[PDB]
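Example 5.3 — Na-translocating NADH-quinone reductase subunit C NqrC
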Amino acid sequence: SLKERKLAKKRDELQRYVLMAADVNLGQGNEFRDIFAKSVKPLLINLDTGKVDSDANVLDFDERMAAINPETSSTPKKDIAKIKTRANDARVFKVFDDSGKLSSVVVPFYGKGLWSMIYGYVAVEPDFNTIKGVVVYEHGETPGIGDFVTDPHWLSLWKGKQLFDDKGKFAMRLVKGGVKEGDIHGVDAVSGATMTGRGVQRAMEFWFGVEGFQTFFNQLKAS
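Solution (predicted structure tokens):
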């Protein structure tokens, strides 16, 4: 029962994170639960094949646990995000507007910053390139330096940016020179905290890379 309250608490935070990333209004009170239930379709997908896998309670799926279990995980070839081990399946979310048309796909990403693992979600538009929103919800980086990652002021900068170039190659780079509106692959680095930012950069590089959600996206582009 203590289990239920905990799961109930994390499911609420999860629902809010996903809607926030997808730029959907959470409504007032507990309406976010109803909005999520109507406009979001949780999915467990096989990262290698891109196929949808089955689970009785997708929202309660423990991705931390799945990543370390030897029978449901593997070691990445190019461990860019320094995660050491990767789950076979990932939980993703398809988000639809009121018209019922696909609005975005929200996927989990995480990777080592400078001193700790950083966890979050990225919402991408149906072109699977343009970012609809980034939400970081957990980290262990030094407060006052690397804890900017959870600051909405900084996270909002990612909106509208594009992950890949015309060669289909990951192109996002954190920039210190001060990013201009036309720099669609650039995000402002937080001076004095560059190493954390490069971690987030590498986190997305992996999870939108060949060992990440690329197969899954290529499957959606087809059918």
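Remark. The longest strand covers residues 102-112.
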